[PDB]
Amino acid sequence: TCPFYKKIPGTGFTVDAFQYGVVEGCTAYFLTHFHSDHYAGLSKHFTFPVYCSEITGNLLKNKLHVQEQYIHPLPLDTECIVNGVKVVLLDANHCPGAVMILFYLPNGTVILHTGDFRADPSMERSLLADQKVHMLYLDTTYCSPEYTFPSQQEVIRFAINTAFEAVTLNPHALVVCGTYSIGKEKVFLAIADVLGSKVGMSQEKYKTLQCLNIPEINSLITTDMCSSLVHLLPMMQINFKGLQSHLKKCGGKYNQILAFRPTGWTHSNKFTRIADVIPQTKGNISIYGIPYSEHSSYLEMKRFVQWLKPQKIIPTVNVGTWKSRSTMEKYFREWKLEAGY
Ligand code: NI
C-alpha cells in the first residue's frame, strides 16, 4: 500500500504514487518529474487525473502514451486551485520540467514537497519566503556530510575547455556524452556550442528532447549522426569496448574518441578538485568521469532547511531501512539546534 510519505494530509492528493494501483481516497495524482522511479506504474492504461508541469505533460503524452483527457498541466510560479485547494508549482532545479509543490491546506497549514531538487539560494527569494511552511517533504538523496561536489558551472567550464582543446589538436576526434534519462542536457549542449556542432542522437532520444521546450532546439540537435561531431549514446556503452565498436560504425570519419560520463557522486569527491581531473585512456579513446549533480549536496540541503525552518521534516529518499532514517533524524536535530527553530 501507498506509504504515508506520498500522501498530503487533509486532501485526497498523492505525489509520485503510481505503482500501488488505485489509491483509496485519492482524487488527484501529482507527478513531480519524468524519471522512471517517480512515474513507475503510469502507462496508456491510467484513467485518473494527473497534475504536473507542461514539460512533464508533453512527455507523458508522447513517450508514455497517457491519454490527453487525464493530463492537467499547470504553469509555474502561479497560484492555482486544484479540487478546492490552493497550490503553486516551483522550479526544482533538477531535470527539465521538474517541480516542487507548495500546498496551502484548508486549516491554514502550509506544506512544501520538494520532489527531487538541487537546493539553491535563488529559492530563498521565491513565493516560499512569503509565509511560514510547517511541513517539508525532503529529497534526502545526499543527506550526509561526505557528499560534496562542484557547482554545475565549474563542471561545464571544465568540459568545454577539455573538449575544445582535444578537437583543436585533432579535428578528426569525435566527442561522445553518455545519458540514461532526461537531465544533464547542458553538458552536451555546452560542448556542442563550443565546437560549432549539433548533437547527434538516436530517434527515441531526439523525440524525448523535442518535448522539453528548449529554445531554438531544432538548431541544436539532429538524427543525422554523420553531420555532427558530438554524439549521445546510452551510459552503458561508455567504455573502451562500446566506444571502439561505435567508432567502427561511423565509417572512418573519426579516428579518436573523447567521452564524458556524467555521474552523481562516487568516492573520489573527497580529495580531487575539478581542475585535477584526468581521464582513463586506452589507445585512441579517453573517458572522463565528471560529477555533474542534479541533487542537493549536504551543504546546499542544510542551508535550505536552516533558512526554511520547518516544524517537521518528512524524508522521501533512503527511507527503506531504520539505520538510514535514524541517521537522517540525527542531522535534522543538529540543524535545528544550531539554527534555533
Ligand atoms: Ni529524479
- Residue 34 CA, distance from chain mean position: 9
Name the CA radius of gyration of the chain, rounded.
Answer: 22
Q: Which of 339, 324, 308, 334 minimizes the C-alpha distance to 119? A: 308
Q: How far is the CA of 53 from the centre of ligand 1 (A)?
A: 14
Q: How far is the CA of 100 from the centre of ligand 1 (A)?
A: 12
Q: How far is the CA of 183 from the centre of ligand 1 (A)?
A: 8
Q: How many CB atoms lie within 10 A of CB 190?
A: 17
Q: Sign of dihedral through CA atoms 121, 74, 211, 35?
A: positive
| Burial classification of residue 138, based on how many CB atoms lie within 10 Å of its CB (0-12 exposed, 13-18 middle, 19 or more buried) | buried
Q: How far is the CA of 262 from the centre of ligand 1 (A)?
A: 14
Residues contacting 340, CB < 8 A, separation 6+:
none
Q: How far is the CA of 134 from the centre of ligand 1 (A)?
A: 24
Q: How far is the CA of 171 from the centre of ligand 1 (A)?
A: 36
Q: Report the C-alpha gap between 128 and 9 in whole angstroms.
A: 19
**How many angstroms separate the most distant Cα atoms in the chain?**
68
- Residue 167 CA, distance from chain mean position: 29
Q: How far is the CA of 42 from the centre of ligand 1 (A)?
A: 16
Q: Sign of dihedral through CA atoms 335, 336, 338, 340?
A: positive
Task: Pinpoint the alpha helices (H) of 36-151.
Answer: 36-39, 54-59
Contact by Cβ (8 Å): 119, 293: no
Q: How far is the CA of 66 from the centre of ligand 1 (A)?
A: 20
Q: How far is the CA of 32 from the centre of ligand 1 (A)?
A: 9
Give the H/E segment covering residue 186: helix 185-194
In the DSSP assignment, the letter for residue 33 is -
Q: How far is the CA of 33 from the centre of ligand 1 (A)?
A: 7
Contact by Cβ (8 Å): 339, 163: no
Q: Report the C-alpha gap between 102 and 60 in whole angstroms.
A: 22
Residues contacting 180, CB < 8 A, separation 6+:
234, 235, 236
Helices then strands, counting H and E runs in the chain, come out as 8, 18
Q: Which of 163, 176, 166, 188 minimizes the C-alpha distance to 244? A: 176
Cell 573527497, located at residue: 270
Q: How far is the CA of 94 from the centre of ligand 1 (A)?
A: 7
Q: Report the C-alpha gap between 57 and 113 in whole angstroms.
A: 19
- Kindly provide the resolution of this structure in angstroms, with one decimal: 2.0
Q: Helices 185-194 and 152-169 meet at what angle, rounded to 10?
A: 40
The method recorded for this entry reads X-ray
Q: Would residue 198 be called left, alpha or beta, if left means φ above 0 and alpha means ψ between -120 and 50 degrees?
A: beta
Provide DSSP, 60-85.
IIIII---GGGEEE--SS--EEETTE
Q: How far is the CA of 292 from the centre of ligand 1 (A)?
A: 14
Q: What are the cell numbers at 228? A: 555532427
Q: How far is the CA of 116 from the centre of ligand 1 (A)?
A: 5
Q: How far is the CA of 141 from the centre of ligand 1 (A)?
A: 10
Residue 138 amino acid letter: L
Q: Which of 94, 99, 97 minimizes the C-alpha distance to 63? A: 97
| Burial classification of residue 172, based on how many CB atoms lie within 10 Å of its CB (0-12 exposed, 13-18 middle, 19 or more buried) | exposed
Domain annotation for the chain: domains and CATH numbers = 1-147+296-341 (3.60.15.10), 148-295 (3.40.50.12650)
In the DSSP assignment, the letter for residue 294 is S
Q: Sign of dihedral through CA atoms 143, 147, 153, 155?
A: negative
Residues contacting 102, CB < 8 A, separation 6+:
87, 88, 89, 90, 110, 111, 112, 127, 128, 133
Q: Sign of dihedral through CA atoms 86, 88, 89, 92?
A: negative
Contact by Cβ (8 Å): 146, 270: yes
Q: How far is the CA of 294 from the centre of ligand 1 (A)?
A: 8
Residues contacting 81, CB < 8 A, separation 6+:
87
Q: Report the C-alpha gap between 250 and 232 in whole angstroms.
A: 13
Q: How many CB atoms lie within 10 A of CB 295?
A: 21
Q: How far is the CA of 35 from the centre of ligand 1 (A)?
A: 5
Contact by Cβ (8 Å): 238, 263: no
